[PDB]
C-alpha cells in the first residue's frame, strides 16, 4: 500500500480505464495519419 488513503485506486483500475479509452483514440488517430 503506497498511500494511507482509505480507498486506493490500484493498478487494475487504471489499466481498465486505459483499455476502455483506447478504442476512441485508435479510431481518431487514423484521421491524423
Amino acid at each position: 500500500k503506497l498511500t494511507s488513503w482509505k480507498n486506493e485506486l490500484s493498478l487494475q483500475a487504471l489499466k481498465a480505464d486505459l483499455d476502455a479509452a483506447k478504442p476512441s483514440h485508435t479510431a481518431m488517430m487514423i484521421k491524423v495519419k
Binding site: 488513503w5 480507498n7 485506486l9 480505464d17 486505459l18 479509452a21
Partner: protein
C-alpha cells in the same frame, strides 16, 4: 467536448533511472522494476523517433517507457473527488500522491486549428484539398506523359 470536464488523462513518455533518482522521495519500488522488459521496442503503442536497435550501454542512462495518470478519484470513499497523480512502469506502481500543482487542473492545453462545434479536436486544410491535389496531379501526369512518350 470540454477539456475541463474530462475525468482523466494518460500520457506516456521515455525516462531513465537518473531522472527517477533525482527525486528519491517521490518514487518507490525502483528495485522491483525490470528495465529490459519495459523498452520502446517492446511496446508498439508508444510512438517515438528513437531507433529500435539503439541501446545505451550504461544501465543508469538507459531509457524506459513510463505512464502517468492525471485524474480525479474518490480517495476517502465518501463521494468527494480530488485530483491525483499515479505513475507506473510495466506492471509496477512506483508513484502515488495528490496533485502537486496549485491550480488543481490537468497540465494539458489543447488548441484547435479549425474548431468543430461541440467537439474537442480540430481539422486541418488537407480534408478540403485532397481531391483537388489528386486531380491536379493527374492532369500534370497526363501532360508529362504526353510530352515524354512522343518522338523528338
Amino acid at each position: 467536448g470540454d477539456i475541463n470536464k474530462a475525468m482523466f488523462a494518460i500520457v506516456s513518455f521515455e525516462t531513465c533511472k537518473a531522472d527517477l533518482l533525482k527525486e528519491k522521495d517521490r518514487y518507490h519500488n525502483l528495485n522491483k522494476i525490470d528495465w529490459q522488459s519495459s523498452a520502446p521496442v517492446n511496446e508498439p503503442d508508444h510512438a517515438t523517433t528513437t531507433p529500435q536497435e539503439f541501446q545505451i550501454s550504461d544501465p543508469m542512462r538507459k531509457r524506459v517507457v513510463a505512464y502517468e495518470y492525471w485524474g480525479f478519484w474518490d480517495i476517502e470513499g465518501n463521494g468527494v473527488l480530488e485530483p491525483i497523480v499515479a505513475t507506473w512502469i510495466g506492471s509496477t506502481l512506483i508513484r502515488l500522491e495528490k496533485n502537486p500543482y496549485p491550480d488543481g487542473k490537468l497540465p494539458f492545453v489543447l488548441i484547435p486549428y479549425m474548431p468543430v462545434k461541440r467537439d474537442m479536436y480540430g481539422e486541418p486544410d488537407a480534408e478540403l484539398l485532397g481531391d483537388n491535389q489528386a486531380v491536379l496531379g493527374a492532369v500534370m501526369r497526363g501532360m508529362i506523359d504526353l510530352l515524354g512518350r512522343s518522338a523528338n
